[PDB]
Amino acid sequence: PTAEDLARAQIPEQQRDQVASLMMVGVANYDQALDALNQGVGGIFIGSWTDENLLTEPGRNIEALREAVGRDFSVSIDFEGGRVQRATNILGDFPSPRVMAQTMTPEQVEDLAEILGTGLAAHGVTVNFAPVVDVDAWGLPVSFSNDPAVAATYATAFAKGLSKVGITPVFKHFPGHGTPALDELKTYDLIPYGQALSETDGAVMVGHMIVPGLGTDGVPSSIDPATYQLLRSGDYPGGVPFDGVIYTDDLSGMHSPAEAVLASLKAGADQALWIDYGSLGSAIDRVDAAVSSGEYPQEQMLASALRVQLLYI
Amino acid sequence: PTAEDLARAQIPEQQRDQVASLMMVGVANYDQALDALNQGVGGIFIGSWTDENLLTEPGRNIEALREAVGRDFSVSIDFEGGRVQRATNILGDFPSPRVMAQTMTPEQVEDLAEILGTGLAAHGVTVNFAPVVDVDAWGLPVVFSNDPAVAATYATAFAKGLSKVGITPVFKHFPGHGTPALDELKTYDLIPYGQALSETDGAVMVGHMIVPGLGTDGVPSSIDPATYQLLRSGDYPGGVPFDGVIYTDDLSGMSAISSPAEAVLASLKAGADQALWIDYGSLGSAIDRVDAAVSSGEYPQEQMLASALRVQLLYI
Fold it and tell me: Could you tell me which residue ranges the Glycoside hydrolase family 3 N-terminal domain spans (chain A) (predicted)?
């Protein structure tokens, strides 16, 4: 059968569970994770402060979660290099992107991601919110004169090593940094997504920056429909259309959380990421009601739910 | 012209510089490091106590130290995985040794150490106080539980990876963390040193633990001469004689189970080649204390110079 037809068959039956699958919440421990997944959430996020026993404690780690929940779900982490977190004592860390491109070859970085990704996979991570593809992050510090082709080359290698061991890489943060106008992003920070999305299977995460000339004035990109339409169409130099899953950056570090979740989904996101402090049920209430009222059109919601289900096939 | 001849010729001229070459201190920043190095210290130790700019700031990094100081010197770091006491975050980190053994092959661990070591080398590191060879660090938590052959296999693979990129690995902590009696260590925590010291060029760090059945009752291993004699002779199951450089664990934190200048002298007298400590305020005092001990014969001159030769060999 067709993979899409198989995923369509895995879309949840109840509408509350359909919209819940479009959300991904940061969790602090095993209990919070199980409570979120029992409400239908499509995935959980392991944050910098997340209890490390959730990775290592037998009977109360990710394998136990998959046991207690009889469905497929995503497990994300932010493992991009050069940043200590609770999970570092367990899983290690990449160097900072600047150190990797300064001192290693693209082949070493790809081989490094395969090895480190092996430890991530063995602990039940399925999504890594990395690599950064910001051009200046892979270059030397201090408008600038870094090379987008370098950022594209190393990000592509990094992502290929993760994919070899079954970890979905996610390029971030679309459409890039340096608030410079869209035209200036198209000749610089947008270039790496070209090679990134045409040579790997990675997903994309949209950031909160406000881009003059993209969509509506003063609106963060993560909740502006023009951002997602740009990603879908690929209408930028070197861009290729993208029909995979689009994540948001953490909507809590941006509105109320529930309104921000709905705002991002309505704009075109497939996975609304945020650090849940208990408001998950209120968000599901608000988003399910928007589908019933027509504020969130049903076919857009179901098209996103199909993209989410394709992750598990 | 042998390798040992070339190193013997680079041994410092004055006796004060000779004994100071047997010391290695933690440094807080570039200005402190350059001041330590102009006092003749053999090497510096980068850690969580160190200004991160010392690794990165142009004109104030390690490369700039090597330009300001004529002679060769060592730059150590503790970069091992699973420890919170990290010098910096820009270099990445290994997974914990348990995670490495659980989830990766020894071929992956070797290649991992070669890759991460490349970043360490490009920032001026020459010595890495890793790997731990304790059997339980490489196995599951304790319920003869874990297999010393696994610790030996992975610690050896880890060490070979660092060497490929010019970083000296240091096996630690001799004669073993776990305090069980020497006879017990001989059947367990001492086993990995056999493969480590016969298959690699790694150095060895002696710890501070008090081992019953080894030397004087109640004396930490780092200042007991019997620890170093055991390491030199390889007088334990599977052990080979080791004539490389022997480090002490951080002398500036030896616990109350037993002054800084006296600790340096005691560890060198006992057989160490590199007296290591973190709090650099006592460097001048230690140079004075050990220098006078060589003049008075308390620290025999041929022992001190043999150690100085081992140290110079790291640079040839």
Answer: 17-309
